[PDB]
């Protein structure tokens, strides 16, 4: 119920910007938005690794990654009319530097596609139901 709310809030924040209104980019630049993004990345990095273990709960993970998608869409929309030595890029870099160790867990998690490549060399007939132990072998 909170994921839906934050998703809609991010979509509104895109629609103020997606047609590149420079006032509605500069105003978000000089605001608390980056201090929200750091906490959001911090929850994402731990929660997607923690929740991924259990097969009981995957819909919540889909909701969370949809929220993360809309967040990065907003961040891209901030950079439409992006001059080279710009301010918005500098603030985004300061944000990412401030939350580097959170980001690195996400990028390490996205190294995954790279999960069925290690599947066919022990398959009996290329089916999809191979052993729990042959997987560790692979």
UniProtKB/Swiss-Prot annotation:
Domain of life of the source: Eukaryota
Disruption phenotype: Embryonically lethal. Embryos die at about 10 dpc, due to defects in heart tube development. Cardiac myotubes display enlarged rough endoplasmic reticulum and cytoplasmic vesicles that contain high levels of Ca(2+).
UniProt-annotated location(s): Sarcoplasmic reticulum membrane
Expressed in which tissues: Highly expressed in heart, lung, cerebellum and brain. Detected at lower levels in adrenal gland, stomach, thymus, esophagus and ovary.
Post-translational modification: Channel activity is modulated by phosphorylation. Phosphorylation is increased in failing heart, leading to calcium leaks and increased cytoplasmic Ca(2+) levels.
Biological role: Cytosolic calcium-activated calcium channel that mediates the release of Ca(2+) from the sarcoplasmic reticulum into the cytosol and thereby plays a key role in triggering cardiac muscle contraction. Aberrant channel activation can lead to cardiac arrhythmia. In cardiac myocytes, calcium release is triggered by increased Ca(2+) cytosolic levels due to activation of the L-type calcium channel CACNA1C. The calcium channel activity is modulated by formation of heterotetramers with RYR3. Required for cellular calcium ion homeostasis. Required for embryonic heart development.
Domain remark from Swiss-Prot or TrEMBL: The calcium release channel activity resides in the C-terminal region while the remaining part of the protein resides in the cytoplasm.
Family the entry assigns: Belongs to the ryanodine receptor (TC 1.A.3.1) family. RYR2 subfamily.
Subunit structure: Homotetramer. Can also form heterotetramers with RYR1 and RYR3. Interacts with CALM and S100A1; these interactions regulate channel activity. Identified in a complex composed of RYR2, FKBP1B, PKA catalytic subunit, PRKAR2A, AKAP6, and the protein phosphatases PP2A and PP1. Interacts directly with FKBP1B, PKA, PP1 and PP2A. Interacts with FKBP1A and FKBP1B; these interactions may stabilize the channel in its closed state and prevent Ca(2+) leaks. Interacts with SELENON. Identified in a complex, composed of FSD2, CMYA5 and RYR2.
UniProt protein name: Ryanodine receptor 2
Native organism: Mus musculus (Mouse)
Gene: Ryr2
Part of the full-length chain shown: 3907 to 4050 of 4966
């Amino acid at each position: 119920k909170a994921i839906q709310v934050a998703k809609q809030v991010f979509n509104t924040l895109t629609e103020y910007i997606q047609g590149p209104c420079t006032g509605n980019q500069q105003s978000l630049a000089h605001s608390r938005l980056w201090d929200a993004v750091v906490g959001f990345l911090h929850v994402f990095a731990h929660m997607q690794m923690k929740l991924s273990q259990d097969s009981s709960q995957i819909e919540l993970l889909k909701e969370l990654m949809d929220l993360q998608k809309d967040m990065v869409v907003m961040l891209l929309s901030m950079l439409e009319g992006n001059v080279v030595n710009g301010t918005i890029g500098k603030q985004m870099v300061d944000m990412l530097v401030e939350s580097s160790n959170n980001v690195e867990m996400i990028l390490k998690f996205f190294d995954m596609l790279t999960s069925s490549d290690t599947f066919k060399e022990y398959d009996p007939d290329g089916k999809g139901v191979i052993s729990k132990r042959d997987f560790h072998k692979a």
